Amino acid sequence: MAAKAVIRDVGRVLGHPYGFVDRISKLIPPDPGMTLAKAFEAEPQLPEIYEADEEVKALIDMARKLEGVTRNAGKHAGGVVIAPTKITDFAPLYCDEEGKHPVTQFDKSDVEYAGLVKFDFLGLRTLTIINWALEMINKRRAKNGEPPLDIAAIPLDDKKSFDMLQRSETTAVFQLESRGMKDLIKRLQPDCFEDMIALVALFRPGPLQSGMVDNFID
Amino acid sequence: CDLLGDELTHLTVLAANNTGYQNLTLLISKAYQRGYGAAGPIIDRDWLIELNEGLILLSGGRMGDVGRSLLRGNSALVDECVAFYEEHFPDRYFLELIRTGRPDEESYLHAAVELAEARGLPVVATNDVRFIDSSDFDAHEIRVA
Amino acid sequence: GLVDECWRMGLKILPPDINSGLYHFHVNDDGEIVYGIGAIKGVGEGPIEAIIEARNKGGYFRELFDLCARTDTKKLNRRVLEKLIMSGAFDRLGPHRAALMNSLGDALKAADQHAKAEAIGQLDLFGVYASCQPWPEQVVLDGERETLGLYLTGHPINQYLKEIERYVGGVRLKDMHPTERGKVITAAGLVVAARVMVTKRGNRIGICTLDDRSGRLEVMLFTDALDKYQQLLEKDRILIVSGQVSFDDFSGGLKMTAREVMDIDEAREKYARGLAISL
Amino acid sequence: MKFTVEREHLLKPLQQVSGPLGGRPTLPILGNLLLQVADGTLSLTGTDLEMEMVARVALVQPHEPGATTVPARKFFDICRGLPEGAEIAVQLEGERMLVRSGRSRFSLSTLPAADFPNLDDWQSEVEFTLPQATMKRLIEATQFSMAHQDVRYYLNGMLFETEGEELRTVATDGHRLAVCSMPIGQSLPSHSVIVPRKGVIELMRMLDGGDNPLRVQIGSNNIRAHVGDFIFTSKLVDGRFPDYRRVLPKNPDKHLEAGCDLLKQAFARAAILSNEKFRGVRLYVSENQLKITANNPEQEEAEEILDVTYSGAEMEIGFNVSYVLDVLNALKCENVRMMLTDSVSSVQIEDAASQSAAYVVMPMRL
Amino acid sequence: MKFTVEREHLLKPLQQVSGPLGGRPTLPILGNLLLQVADGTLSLTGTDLEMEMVARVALVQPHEPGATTVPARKFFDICRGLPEGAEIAVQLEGERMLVRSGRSRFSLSTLPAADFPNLDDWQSEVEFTLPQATMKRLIEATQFSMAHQDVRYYLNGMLFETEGEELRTVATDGHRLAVCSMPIGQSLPSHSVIVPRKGVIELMRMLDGGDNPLRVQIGSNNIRAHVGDFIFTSKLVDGRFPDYRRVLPKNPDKHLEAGCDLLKQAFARAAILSNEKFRGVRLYVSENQLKITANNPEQEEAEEILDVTYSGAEMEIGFNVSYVLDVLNALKCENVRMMLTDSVSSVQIEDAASQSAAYVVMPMRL
Amino acid sequence: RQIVLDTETTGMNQIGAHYEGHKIIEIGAVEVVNRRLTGNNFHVYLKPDRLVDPEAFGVHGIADEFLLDKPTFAEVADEFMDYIRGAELVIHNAAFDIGFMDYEFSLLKRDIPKTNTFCKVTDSLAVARKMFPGKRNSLDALCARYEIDNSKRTLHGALLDAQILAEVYLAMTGGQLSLPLAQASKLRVVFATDEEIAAHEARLDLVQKKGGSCLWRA
């Protein structure tokens, strides 16, 4: 039960129409880990409508009792685990409505702490991108009989690469698409791979608001 | 079970040792592999025949096979139901007893105590707890809903 | 976002084509890019495969009629055909788009009559700018956005304003200068507008689009002037503004609002334009 | 306004005029009646823009002119519900109509006569008179072949062709055809007009099958029908009806007769084991023998053997059985004659002994 | 496997057996009948798995045992369709059923008898026979008050309760209630069973009112009706019908009597100007006079005044007119006696001549 | 004896105290006995002490200059108090009206307690919400639901709504009533066997050795 969800769900069960309750939930800040204590500090209208509205009070008092509580199994799984013997030697299964997609009844942290090694599922489609781009590059082979291209075999000082980077044309360049990050690239004009390793570690609230980024650049 | 048709009953299932634990793990997997409807996954009573050793059984109380049959007042049905546990789970099948002020509890309880003495079978009491404090009842009601 | 990047980098880029198109976006030799079929909102999966399958069995489709005969109405429905025209899928063949929209049904009827001649029907008693130039640019491009998502050939006013601007929208707004709510300069390239209501009153309406090619939104709770600012806001091929921005709490739409307005002439005030000639 | 009438004079008109009215139309006033007392006359006008029915009933007691309009449905139900022989005194007062009978007293909300769409009076073009019973035959024999919701909007209705000494009716939906031709015994003008599905339903409805002549006036875009002092007028649509002479089988050389009711009971039965979607059946015919077979997805089969009179070559042809069952039921005859050309062309179906009614269905290939 | 019977021995059985079928049978074999030939007896079952019909007819012509399962509706229609006096010959060949009549032959797909689910034989607890007529009155008199879809699914049905020599039925919504009691002439043990609405509908339909007596058996989980050689079997719904003796008015102090037909005529007419959904009409009673009034949201107004025998105190009461017309339609009697209490209580209603039927409806307070 | 009111005001505060800084302009109430209008309507207009809010103006229209000469709440305090005291107070969005009422009462400084202490305030919206969950239960919503027109009626403001609400109220709380209806004795005690007790001892040893406590052995 995340902040937005718990408010929505409690509000409907308290018998308000969707309009009434959404007027409240849209005031709850976005953040991934949102709690009632955090909500009260981020949004001053929350204290105020709590004291001014009996329905809001009843609702938040109940949302406080159910904060963090687990609702259901999940649209997606957490990962793939490898046992040395049948999985039933360690856990029972949960499966979908057709008894398919069997999953361990213990979650991520718990299942591994109970002794089986796990391997994460990953949704990102950057390797799908590379895949498709490699297909498309290697088509250019028969068009001029050029050997198929090995992204692993590229040189580590490539000027075209660093030219485009110093031009700040790094939207759709993986992880580095932020405007802030492009602000940094512009000022820095990063010219080597070491700098590339650094970027994501520098591009954070701590490094920026401690002057180490500026020291480094200078 | 085929005796009560589509009607679902409540059951508490304990693994008393690791033989039971593995049998319970198999039983759970078997229920999910069978599929289910909106009510969630269900077991066949007779799965308990083969999937048996190391497990101790609680009847479910008024909401169990025997409680529901008792409340119907079908004495033949009651006798046939218990008979299964007397064969396959001697000293390992318990009557759940509950006084929480809910419909039919005391009437069932009175009839179950009579059945329990008539069959030589044991009872255990629980409070079927769902919350910490009495003011949490309202929140649990909302949780279920 | 991606397209904006593409465009700045180069050209072609092309409307979809039933003859040439693959499953997804594809590169012909010269053509940097041609539309992937799955891009289209309305068209089903079955119809996309049907189109390609028919292209496989036949060669390139010679005409609209030829397409309709090879892929029966059963696979490619009239509703489906209508969106394909609106996408610009047919443009090559039927230079007259208007002509092609109308010609579908009659061409379909013949093909079905061929099918009927074949099988399971009841049988019957009896009995029975537009030029080489296509549909106009402004209007055609309008339709494409509705169907595909974006304007082709860049916006109805796509080509620069940069020195005022940043063209980044929500993606820029995330990491912004700190304040209560981001202070921002927006120019609108194109807007189609009214002042609406509800039979109670209602807060709206600004329709803001942010170019260069970036992104546009409904918004959503504003108002200021009552009707005077509303009509200044109004309507074809003009606007630059100063407006206060917040990043919306809810995802899938932001606040970009017109607090202030300036005219083309007022935008031409913009600071004060200077003349630059490159000789 | 004030008149008082005998339930029995008012009741059949009320029924004839109300019965096609939807309780709740899309345009409110269409569910109300225009009431006019002028001279010693009540004129009733209720419409749906497509058709209009006008009734007059003699006012033998004191009366008072005015205009009013009350909900049609509700008024009809009220009058139907009234006791036998009831003398009802109603009086319009401002914009409430008070309805009395004995000790019953009513008060109805009212919408103004002025709001009622007065459609146009027009000049008659072709005129003729006929027994009510002939009109009903003409319509019954033919009306079931109209389409429901076909794009060819002029098939929801009937071609009128009046030529020489004959009046003829024919109706079709593109898939089956019915022709009826009957002598009217007067020289008429030449005019064609297509009247709608709903018009034909209502004309058939008011054919109280007896003696009374029916006089009808067709205009260029309007039609009006009087039987006595019951008056029906509908708007027409004009467009391009198909030519029955292109549908008529050329010279059907082969003739096939069988007893009609036995043929019909047998087709009703073979229909049960037919493909659910098309109700399709296959006929195999040979010298003095007839074999009808069907089949469905359920893998059931039908075969019929019966004795029929058939001399001629064997023939293979499929139909939708509902379409032939429709004609066999309408035809109340002993023996029928079927005239085929071939499997790909029209077949004419008719009483072997009469020709007043004629039906053609085009066949299928399964 | 073979048998031969004549169409006319099969017609009334077949009609009767085909009634319970329409269930959108999800388990497809519910749309089929179980045929068992054993001895010189063909047994049929037609069922929705909650209720069942078995019939035996003796076979005089040649037969051979074996069993099959054909689709019920389609089989019923074919046989009903065959001509009067026709001798129809049926024969199972392994996995297909052949239907012949003289020279026509039909071959239907078949589902095996051996797959057809069997609801168990059970034992009877209370037993009685009676004239059809008595059972007819009993059902007709009460069935209209059954709920269709209620949370209290046991009310989707009728309480059967025996006591002395009375069988006594009640059916209800929670809003209106009818009770009917008749003398049965036999000592009856006390029993309580609720038979499902679908059950009572079908039972109603099997009564021709003729001379064959009805003989009934009731067990713990099923109820069965034998009239001659036809047998109906249904299951019962579990129980806990609320006590109608609690809701009864305790000495309703006002007596109000009127001619049933006149009264019913006035309600039907007044109903036309009530709220379409809720049908709320208001009643003013005074010394020997009845004033009915009705209002609807569109400001339309009905009034009926009538001469009514009534001794008692003046009071006003409003109620749903549809529900009271339902009872007036079930009351097949000359005059009705109404027993009232006050503006906020249900009223008790009887035939002015018989205590046999009793009706009580709740008021709406408008 | 049943008392119906609906008060439309000089607009409202959206946040916090909807009554703070605001004042009542018109009081329009109908008195209901035995679910009928006697026709003894109490319809009065009072002193604004401030400007009518643009919102309230658009709701049903009303000029500030019209309520200037009209008396204040102090002039009809006793008059209105006795009219409603010790009766049934049925209000739509009771928090709104009651809030204003008690607000004005305290401003008089006349020791008059809050109306909720001597009158039973019952919200009709709560009832409607119970009956029609997740449906629009506004006045105009229910109006359209039961096919009542409150828009093409000349009365704009309190008396309008009061009348309409009365009819609606009675309809919902009439609607058709329903019939419906809605320890000693010997007994075995399986005592753990010696083998089970050995397993118990071993299991407690585990609890204790791993956790540093066992309340069973304390």
Residue numbers in the entry:
A (entry chain A): 436 to 653
B (entry chain A): 74 to 218
C (entry chain A): 799 to 926, 938 to 1088
D (entry chain C), E (entry chain B): 1 to 366
F (entry chain D): 7 to 188, 208 to 243
How do the authors describe this structure?
For processivity, PolIIIα binds to the DNA sliding clamp (β subunit). structures of the complex in both a DNA-bound and a DNA-free state to 8 Å resolution. exonuclease simultaneously binds the polymerase and clamp. conformational changes from the DNA-free to the DNA-bound state.
the clamp in the DNA-free structure showing the ‘DNA-free’ map. panel: bottom view of the polymerase showing the ‘DNA-free’ map. end of τ is in contact with the tail of the polymerase. τ500 and the fingers domain of the polymerase. between τ500 and the tail of PolIIIα must be stable.
